[PDB]
Amino acid sequence: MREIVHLQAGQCGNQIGAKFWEVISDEHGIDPTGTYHGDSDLQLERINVYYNEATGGKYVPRAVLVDLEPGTMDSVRSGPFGQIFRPDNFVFGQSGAGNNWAKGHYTEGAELVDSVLDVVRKEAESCDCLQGFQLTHSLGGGTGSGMGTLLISKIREEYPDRIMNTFSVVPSPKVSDTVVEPYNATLSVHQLVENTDETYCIDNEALYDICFRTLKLTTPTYGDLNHLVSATMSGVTTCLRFPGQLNADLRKLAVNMVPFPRLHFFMPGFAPLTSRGSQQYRALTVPELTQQMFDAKNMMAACDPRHGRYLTVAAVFRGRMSMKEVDEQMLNVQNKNSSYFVEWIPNNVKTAVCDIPPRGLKMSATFIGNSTAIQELFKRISEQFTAMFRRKAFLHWYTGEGMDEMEFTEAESNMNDLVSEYQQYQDATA
Amino acid sequence: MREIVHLQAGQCGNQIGAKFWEVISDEHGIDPTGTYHGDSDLQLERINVYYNEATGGKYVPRAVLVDLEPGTMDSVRSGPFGQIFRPDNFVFGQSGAGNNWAKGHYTEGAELVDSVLDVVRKEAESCDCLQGFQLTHSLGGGTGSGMGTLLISKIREEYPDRIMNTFSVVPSPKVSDTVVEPYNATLSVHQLVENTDETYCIDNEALYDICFRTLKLTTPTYGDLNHLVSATMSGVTTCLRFPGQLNADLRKLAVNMVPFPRLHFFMPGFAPLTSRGSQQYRALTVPELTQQMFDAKNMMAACDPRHGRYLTVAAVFRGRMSMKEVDEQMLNVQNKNSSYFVEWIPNNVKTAVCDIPPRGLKMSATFIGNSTAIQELFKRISEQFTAMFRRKAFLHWYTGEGMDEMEFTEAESNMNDLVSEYQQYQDATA
Amino acid sequence: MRECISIHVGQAGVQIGNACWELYCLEHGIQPDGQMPSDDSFNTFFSETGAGKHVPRAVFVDLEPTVVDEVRTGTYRQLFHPEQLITGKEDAANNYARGHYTIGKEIVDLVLDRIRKLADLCTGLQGFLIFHSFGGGTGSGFASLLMERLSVDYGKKSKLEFAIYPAPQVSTAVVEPYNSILTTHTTLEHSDCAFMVDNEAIYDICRRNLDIERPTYTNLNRLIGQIVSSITASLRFDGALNVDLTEFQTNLVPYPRIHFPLATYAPVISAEKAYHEQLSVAEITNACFEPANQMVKCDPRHGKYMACCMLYRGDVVPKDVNAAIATIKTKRTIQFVDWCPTGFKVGINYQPPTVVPGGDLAKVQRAVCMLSNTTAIAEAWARLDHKFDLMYAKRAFVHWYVGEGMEEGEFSEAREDLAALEKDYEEVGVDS
Amino acid sequence: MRECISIHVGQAGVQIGNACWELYCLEHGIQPDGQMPSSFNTFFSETGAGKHVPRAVFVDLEPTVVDEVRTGTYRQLFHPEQLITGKEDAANNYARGHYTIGKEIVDLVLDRIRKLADLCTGLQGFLIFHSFGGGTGSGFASLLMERLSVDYGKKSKLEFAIYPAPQVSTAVVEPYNSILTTHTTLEHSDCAFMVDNEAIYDICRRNLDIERPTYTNLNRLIGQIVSSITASLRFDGALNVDLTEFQTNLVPYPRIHFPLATYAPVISAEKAYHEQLSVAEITNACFEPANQMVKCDPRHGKYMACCMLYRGDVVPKDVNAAIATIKTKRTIQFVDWCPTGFKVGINYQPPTVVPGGDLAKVQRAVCMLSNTTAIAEAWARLDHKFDLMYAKRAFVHWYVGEGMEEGEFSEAREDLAALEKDYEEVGVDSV
Amino acid sequence: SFRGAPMLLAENCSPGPRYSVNP
Amino acid sequence: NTTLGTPTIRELSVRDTVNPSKSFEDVLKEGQEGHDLYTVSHNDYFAGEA
Ligand SMILES: Nc1nc2c(ncn2[C@@H]2O[C@H](COP(=O)(O)OP(=O)(O)OP(=O)(O)O)[C@@H](O)[C@H]2O)c(=O)[nH]1
Ligand SMILES: Nc1nc2c(ncn2[C@@H]2O[C@H](COP(=O)(O)OP(=O)(O)OP(=O)(O)O)[C@@H](O)[C@H]2O)c(=O)[nH]1
Ligand SMILES: Nc1nc2c(ncn2[C@@H]2O[C@H](COP(=O)(O)OP(=O)(O)O)[C@@H](O)[C@H]2O)c(=O)[nH]1
Ligand SMILES: Nc1nc2c(ncn2[C@@H]2O[C@H](COP(=O)(O)OP(=O)(O)O)[C@@H](O)[C@H]2O)c(=O)[nH]1
Ligand SMILES: [Mg+2]
Ligand SMILES: [Mg+2]
């Protein structure tokens, strides 16, 4: 009908999808067993989007969990909704890539791609009308940043027309957890710009910044950061999954979000974030929802849109409001902050409304923004990559895998080509 | 009416048939004593097909247990359904063949045949209209692969028009339990091509792959080996022993599955093989069977169907189902796989439906298929069989029985002709 | 039903006979009187009588009395007829000459009449288990003359041949290679299968694994009895794949002249070592293939295998048997002949091996017996030809053999008969 | 699943392995018999009856240092075949331990490694422990790496090594063996953990307040270091870090695989419970020059890499706070071609405590693996020592009579000089 | 579709049991 | 008096797995399941029903 198959790669990707599959399961009134204990009829009308039927009142997530190290699935299997999943989709290796991109891309990936390609062929063909696939990974690992790219390269030539989204995690320069982090990312994002309909840029450090100030948790775990990220991907698809006052979906956004095919990187936002003391004294109205929405501190990307020009902005809202009160807040922000919006597109903001609020909250919103500030992310990687690459440091790890030295050169040129035309779009006269 | 006589030759045939008779007894509600404890009239409806009548409301299987060694019949007689057989159906010699094919075929087995022809004629003349003969054996034995080949030679001359099948076990190179096994097989297939309407090539290796992977069994015993055959031959005749929505019998498949008299070799299939865990995540829907119907992991032979073209395909379904989806998934599979299937025969596949489900289940299917992959079975033997024959290795056990050197060349010649014609039909233009 | 008759010859056959016939008695539960206190699994070795007494199917024939008189004065004296303990007044005294033509001929008839009546007792006869040595005069010459009269009497019946091989280094005799060389004609044309084994390799394994630093002759024979019991375990008890003698007799012998496989049994370990060692199937098949566990002092790397016979026993599953054989075949260090990529005969049984009190092996649920026919045994006969030649040049100890009554010519012809056997193995090693 | 095999070599090897397997058994709950009355698959293997055997092969050339273990409390814990002894030792002679005595037992130890490879299914690492002073622990170790490389070209082999102390020395002929072990530790290893006893003596005196330490006190710290390394493998964490991962983020060039470890906190019970303990303080203590177990100052050199491993009750927030605090310091220097030189691992379970030991029960701890250029000065001093020994040709006749050509001494000196020059090239900045 | 997965294997390797022991 | 090694008692009996003792009416009830919610969820129906 409208199905999305969820591909899960890497420990970052595996933990981000467990929390994700938790909240959507909560959204439909699904117990950890997998039956239905919800109340409203609407809680089960479009469960076919993410779930496949099973006997005895059962439903299963439409998931494919892949990780080159077998020691991560057991943590997932002992997790909250560990047994709701279909264990035939646990397709894993034995010897890990050790955060080496080429090992997961060339050496050890080639053995495990066929089995996961069978099981994505399993689920995609099982459904009737497939909207597209989704993939979750990080750009700092060896499997999600590595073999995960190979899956995209294969899946595009098989099914070209289906929408391809990845909630990729970009490594941060201020806090890094891998020395060869720029080497994999430079060789990874090159695959994204050629084969991906759209990619979402989420940085952990920006999640750390939000949890520091907006929420003020003394000890926020990696579940909380996942819980923030899990809100976004539920907020993107709530318009397609539930009836909305005005409806949209992934293709409605994606056609409206991407001016030229080389630019499909987005900064996500999610509006109602309040600390435990701030729930007491607030008035849940749509004006303050926009004020919290458009400040730069709520951003979970690592780039300030006050340093660039907003080319397009998307803001899908969840709950019942008046779109009138939605519409001037759209209009007012475009008029007041005229400089931050480009001139060759008037009406830079696109919105949608889904009637049903997120379950457990009254008002919420999600944000998809493509601004000129994303080129800040790319260039600060290049200052680290060229630092690595001038003295050929950490190069014997790659070259021993059998690939050539020119592949770094062709990737960086595509990076330098991309940011240059990205800069060129910034300085454009009407 | 339409009666069946089950020949039982060799230790492999004896244990398989012992489990086989146990299966259908539960399907027909016959206790180990020999009486009827079932409830449905359909149980006693077509009970004469397999069993014969005795006084006191007792029914007795129609089988001929043949083995050169008297030790196997003690194990069979001590089995669970052990006393239901007739003591003079047990026709056994005192010495074995020693896995020497010429000994069973010529020297010692020719002493035991005359007692065997007495009993097989006895069960033949009791029934007014016998359907056909059924024999199970291994091509790697001495009695089953040896004297058993002689048994099918004579019975064909006596009864020309009745069908006969053989659920023969075909040897495998990666796990070989006998070194003269290619010698026994090469002299056994030459008997099979001349006088056999249909053959079900069972490889023991793939079944170990079946239980380890799909079923997840730590210690699969030889009883679990015999199950998956015992469920298979039960499924072939479940249209014969019970009324069906679309009827079939052994002859309906036999005329439909043999395009030319040389090709009668088939790889079986069974749809609902699922582990204990897999019943939790499963929908008992007929699209789910079709994948388990058509997956190469499902096959019981040692030939991947991807490397050859499907000639004639057959599918019998055991259970109550709408047959719009019988011929829908039918058409979907053939259209999508138009390259693999042969082109000179459109609509390659067969259907049959039995309303009565399997005992302990709702819905079962049995696959019988003729493809070009089966030619990979025999040429593997010829690569290995030619090895010993070139140096005349293991020849004195054969030559010492009073037999020549010509038949080794003739059996290979008849073999090498069969694959060549089989390959010729692989490379054919419509 | 299957039956087997024991023709133990020599002091070695008698001593092994005391060990082995003890092993089957505890296996089946026969009391030292010969009555079961509690189906017919004993029919292969034992025979019922009028008084319900179970009689072993064996003959203990020696040519010196004192070795057998110990059996006559032992605990299990009451388990035989006072006929087949056939003795002789004067022995050959380590002479093939005396035991073939002079002293053996006085009890040819009585030995051959005895084997006739046991064969008359049995209905379905499978084969004969004959135990002797290549060293002793009674064990070599007399065992030869009985055999060549057994070939005429029973043409088809299987004649498996357990024989003791003199060790490459240690020896209890100086004239033993003279007996050994002439006996090869008996084991080449007048046999179906050979189990040549030296005492020296059995000395090594018990010390290294079983912690038997001082091996007496009883410890070696206990390992011999377990190997024999493993061969006939398929006959005595049921299994998932029972393998009779003709089943494995066919599957070791590519050419009529080449019937000399190598025996190997595993696991052989003490209780002190097995406690910290988990036991399964995958590693014990690797135990059959170590050069240090070979019952014959030889290197498997020097030769290549043409046929291998697996005899698993106990709580075993065929799946990991297939899994184990997958690992063995996927190895370059394993070498197989070009004309046999499938060289394996697997035997599966239910009942585990039994343990005798006062023994050495610990009680282990699973075990495997290996019977490997390789060309690595070719060098084993090469050293005797060198040892024979440096006595043949000096004409030493020939007056003993000539005085007893053979022409000297047959000494030379037998040497060429061994030599022809060497080149036949060399043709096997050649790969086209 | 993950598996690591310990191949303890020499007297240092057997004593360190005694310590290590002790604290491992108390970590997981294994009895001295080897049963759990009530994650273990990486270092113990199961039996049918519930017994668990360690995956270690203790091997030496002098039987006493292992027969003490044979009569020790863990006699039935270890499989007796895992204990391999030689009749005679090298007596601190590299040529003896590499070319006269070792080749007798090489076949036995390699067959044992074959047996452990058969026992294991997914093997992760070989952890070898030895010293650079002892003749057996140098030459035998060298030949076993040389063969084990061609038996498993791909498998990772971490090399824990005792480096001869800069001032104190238990032997006089130790620089020759230390010189000749370098070729093997260069061309047959993936990561090496040289450490001297003098700095651990200093740490134990200054921090843990034992005025007269023993070898057990040092070995307990080494076992704690190994436990901190392998805790990510043994149990879950927010960021589990595998050996392949932290071996990736430590080695810039194939010739440079010599990180320096560090552990914190290291303090007594009263001061431990009585001071507030936090991530900022333990991370600052990790970079103190006085807490390094290798007698060199990283302030004299430049860091190229830092592999960080927290353990216990730790939070990513204060992890990143500490990483920013450390980055904002002019005293700590970093090479130009590594603006991001950190890789942090997080593990849930706190480190355990061993009785008779020195550490307190502490809710959080930290290991550091710093790859810097400050280690090359130690090789420079040992080169000076080796030159002043080799000028007089002292003790050369021992190795010559053992049967070795003389020029490989100068060859190994040339190799060390080339390694030092490579370290200097890495130290050179392109500004 | 046609579901062809005869490829799903893990990794396991070890050298040969031929090396001498010297009795 | 004691046997050593790893005896692996059977994981499953494939009789019980694929052809269980579940009676035909119990199979019918299992197929019946939550049929109304199934028809709403994934359009899966029984035969011969509008
Ligand atoms: N393994 C083993 N070998 C034995 C045993 N007893 C004798 N032998 C071998 O037999 C050889 C000598 O032959 P014996 O069996 O002792 O005596 P014999 O066969 O009667 O021949 P004569 O001494 O001439 O009478 C010796 O070299 C031993 O190797 C035994 O108990 N175990
Ligand atoms: N840290 C530490 N070092 C040790 C220990 N035991 C020995 N060593 C070091 O090992 C060096 C000498 O080698 P040993 O370990 O005693 O024995 P070996 O390595 O087998 O060499 P040989 O003495 O020739 O047999 C000494 O200089 C010590 O520094 C120990 O328990 N802990
Ligand atoms: N947001 C988020 N990031 C995570 C989580 N777990 C790990 N990561 C990130 O993932 C990166 C390591 O990924 P890795 O496991 O090597 O990926 P793989 O090689 O594909 O398996 C680190 O930089 C972490 O920042 C999580 O739960 N949430
Ligand atoms: N599927 C199955 N195969 C068996 C069984 N018993 C034996 N076999 C196979 O049959 C072959 C040996 O047959 P064998 O006993 O020598 O037959 P015979 O000589 O005619 O009595 C072996 O390779 C086994 O794989 C059984 O119960 N089931
Ligand atoms: Mg004697
Ligand atoms: Mg020492």
Short mmCIF file of N, CA and C in Angstrom, two decimals, chain A residues 255-321:
data_model
loop_
_atom_site.label_atom_id
_atom_site.label_comp_id
_atom_site.label_asym_id
_atom_site.label_seq_id
_atom_site.Cartn_x
_atom_site.Cartn_y
_atom_site.Cartn_z
N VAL A 255 10.21 15.70 -3.22
CA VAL A 255 10.07 16.47 -4.45
C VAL A 255 10.12 17.97 -4.14
N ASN A 256 9.52 18.38 -3.03
CA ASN A 256 9.48 19.78 -2.63
C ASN A 256 10.74 20.24 -1.89
N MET A 257 11.59 19.32 -1.44
CA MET A 257 12.73 19.64 -0.59
C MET A 257 14.03 19.83 -1.37
N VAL A 258 14.18 19.19 -2.52
CA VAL A 258 15.46 19.10 -3.21
C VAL A 258 15.38 19.94 -4.49
N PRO A 259 16.07 21.08 -4.53
CA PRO A 259 16.09 21.86 -5.78
C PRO A 259 16.87 21.19 -6.89
N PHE A 260 18.08 20.72 -6.60
CA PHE A 260 18.94 20.05 -7.56
C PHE A 260 19.43 18.74 -6.95
N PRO A 261 19.62 17.70 -7.78
CA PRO A 261 19.85 16.35 -7.22
C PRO A 261 21.10 16.21 -6.38
N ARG A 262 22.07 17.12 -6.50
CA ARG A 262 23.29 17.01 -5.72
C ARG A 262 23.10 17.42 -4.26
N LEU A 263 21.99 18.08 -3.92
CA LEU A 263 21.77 18.62 -2.58
C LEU A 263 20.58 17.91 -1.95
N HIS A 264 20.85 16.96 -1.06
CA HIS A 264 19.78 16.26 -0.37
C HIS A 264 20.13 16.00 1.10
N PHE A 265 20.88 16.91 1.71
CA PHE A 265 21.31 16.81 3.10
C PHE A 265 20.48 17.78 3.94
N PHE A 266 19.96 17.30 5.08
CA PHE A 266 18.99 18.06 5.85
C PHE A 266 19.34 18.09 7.33
N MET A 267 18.94 19.19 7.97
CA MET A 267 19.08 19.40 9.41
C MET A 267 17.73 19.14 10.05
N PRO A 268 17.57 18.14 10.91
CA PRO A 268 16.25 17.90 11.49
C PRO A 268 16.04 18.65 12.80
N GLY A 269 14.80 19.08 13.01
CA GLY A 269 14.41 19.67 14.27
C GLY A 269 13.10 19.07 14.75
N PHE A 270 12.89 19.19 16.06
CA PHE A 270 11.70 18.66 16.72
C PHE A 270 11.38 19.63 17.86
N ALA A 271 10.13 20.11 17.92
CA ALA A 271 9.86 21.36 18.62
C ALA A 271 9.72 21.21 20.14
N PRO A 272 8.73 20.46 20.68
CA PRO A 272 8.43 20.64 22.12
C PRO A 272 9.42 19.96 23.07
N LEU A 273 10.52 20.65 23.35
CA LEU A 273 11.52 20.19 24.31
C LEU A 273 11.54 21.13 25.51
N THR A 274 11.25 20.58 26.67
CA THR A 274 11.10 21.34 27.90
C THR A 274 11.68 20.53 29.04
N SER A 275 12.36 21.21 29.95
CA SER A 275 12.89 20.56 31.13
C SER A 275 11.78 20.29 32.13
N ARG A 276 12.11 19.51 33.16
CA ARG A 276 11.11 19.03 34.10
C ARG A 276 10.49 20.17 34.91
N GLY A 277 11.21 21.28 35.06
CA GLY A 277 10.66 22.42 35.77
C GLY A 277 9.90 23.36 34.86
N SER A 278 10.17 23.27 33.56
CA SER A 278 9.52 24.14 32.58
C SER A 278 8.18 23.60 32.10
N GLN A 279 7.86 22.34 32.38
CA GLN A 279 6.51 21.85 32.09
C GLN A 279 5.48 22.53 32.96
N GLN A 280 5.88 23.00 34.14
CA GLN A 280 4.94 23.61 35.07
C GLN A 280 4.42 24.94 34.54
N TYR A 281 5.32 25.79 34.05
CA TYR A 281 4.97 27.16 33.67
C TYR A 281 5.20 27.31 32.17
N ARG A 282 4.20 26.92 31.38
CA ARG A 282 4.20 27.16 29.95
C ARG A 282 2.76 27.13 29.46
N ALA A 283 2.56 27.64 28.25
CA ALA A 283 1.24 27.67 27.63
C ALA A 283 1.37 27.07 26.24
N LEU A 284 0.89 25.84 26.06
CA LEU A 284 1.10 25.11 24.81
C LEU A 284 0.28 25.77 23.71
N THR A 285 0.92 26.68 22.98
CA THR A 285 0.31 27.35 21.84
C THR A 285 1.30 27.32 20.68
N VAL A 286 0.76 27.34 19.47
CA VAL A 286 1.59 27.22 18.27
C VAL A 286 2.56 28.39 18.07
N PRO A 287 2.34 29.63 18.56
CA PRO A 287 3.43 30.62 18.43
C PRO A 287 4.72 30.22 19.11
N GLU A 288 4.67 29.78 20.37
CA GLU A 288 5.89 29.39 21.07
C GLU A 288 6.50 28.13 20.47
N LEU A 289 5.67 27.30 19.82
CA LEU A 289 6.20 26.14 19.11
C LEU A 289 7.15 26.57 18.00
N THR A 290 6.81 27.64 17.27
CA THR A 290 7.70 28.14 16.23
C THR A 290 8.92 28.86 16.79
N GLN A 291 8.76 29.58 17.90
CA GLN A 291 9.91 30.28 18.48
C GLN A 291 10.98 29.29 18.93
N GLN A 292 10.56 28.22 19.60
CA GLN A 292 11.50 27.16 19.96
C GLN A 292 11.99 26.43 18.72
N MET A 293 11.19 26.42 17.65
CA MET A 293 11.54 25.67 16.45
C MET A 293 12.74 26.28 15.73
N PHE A 294 12.75 27.60 15.58
CA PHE A 294 13.66 28.24 14.64
C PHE A 294 14.91 28.83 15.28
N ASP A 295 15.04 28.78 16.60
CA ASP A 295 16.31 29.16 17.20
C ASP A 295 17.36 28.09 16.91
N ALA A 296 18.62 28.51 16.86
CA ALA A 296 19.69 27.60 16.45
C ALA A 296 20.10 26.61 17.53
N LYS A 297 19.75 26.86 18.80
CA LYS A 297 20.21 25.99 19.87
C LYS A 297 19.44 24.67 19.89
N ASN A 298 18.20 24.65 19.41
CA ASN A 298 17.45 23.40 19.35
C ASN A 298 17.95 22.47 18.26
N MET A 299 18.91 22.92 17.44
CA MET A 299 19.26 22.20 16.23
C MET A 299 20.06 20.96 16.63
N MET A 300 19.75 19.80 16.05
CA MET A 300 20.59 18.63 16.27
C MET A 300 21.57 18.35 15.14
N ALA A 301 21.77 19.30 14.22
CA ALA A 301 22.98 19.32 13.42
C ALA A 301 23.98 20.28 14.05
N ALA A 302 25.22 20.22 13.57
CA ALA A 302 26.33 20.95 14.17
C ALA A 302 26.69 22.20 13.37
N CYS A 303 25.70 22.87 12.82
CA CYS A 303 25.96 23.99 11.92
C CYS A 303 24.92 25.07 12.12
N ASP A 304 25.37 26.32 12.12
CA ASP A 304 24.53 27.46 12.45
C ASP A 304 23.91 28.02 11.17
N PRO A 305 22.59 27.97 11.00
CA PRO A 305 21.98 28.51 9.78
C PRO A 305 21.98 30.03 9.72
N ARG A 306 22.38 30.71 10.79
CA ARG A 306 22.63 32.15 10.70
C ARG A 306 23.87 32.47 9.88
N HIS A 307 24.72 31.48 9.61
CA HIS A 307 25.90 31.66 8.77
C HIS A 307 25.64 31.34 7.31
N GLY A 308 24.44 30.89 6.96
CA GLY A 308 24.11 30.55 5.59
C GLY A 308 22.71 31.01 5.24
N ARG A 309 22.34 30.76 3.99
CA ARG A 309 21.03 31.13 3.48
C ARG A 309 20.13 29.90 3.44
N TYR A 310 18.97 30.01 4.09
CA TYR A 310 17.96 28.96 4.01
C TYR A 310 17.40 28.93 2.60
N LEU A 311 17.51 27.78 1.94
CA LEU A 311 16.99 27.68 0.58
C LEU A 311 15.55 27.16 0.61
N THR A 312 15.29 26.16 1.45
CA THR A 312 13.96 25.61 1.67
C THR A 312 13.85 25.15 3.12
N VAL A 313 12.63 25.18 3.65
CA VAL A 313 12.35 24.80 5.03
C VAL A 313 11.06 23.98 5.05
N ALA A 314 11.07 22.86 5.77
CA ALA A 314 9.88 22.05 5.97
C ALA A 314 9.58 21.94 7.46
N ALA A 315 8.30 22.03 7.81
CA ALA A 315 7.87 21.95 9.20
C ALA A 315 6.52 21.24 9.23
N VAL A 316 6.55 19.94 9.49
CA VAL A 316 5.35 19.13 9.64
C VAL A 316 4.95 19.14 11.10
N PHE A 317 3.69 19.44 11.37
CA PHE A 317 3.19 19.58 12.73
C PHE A 317 2.30 18.39 13.07
N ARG A 318 2.26 18.05 14.36
CA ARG A 318 1.52 16.89 14.84
C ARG A 318 0.54 17.34 15.91
N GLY A 319 -0.74 17.05 15.69
CA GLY A 319 -1.80 17.44 16.60
C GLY A 319 -2.89 18.21 15.89
N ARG A 320 -3.86 18.67 16.67
CA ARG A 320 -4.93 19.52 16.17
C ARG A 320 -4.61 20.97 16.50
N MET A 321 -4.60 21.82 15.47
CA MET A 321 -4.44 23.26 15.64
C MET A 321 -5.42 23.95 14.69
#
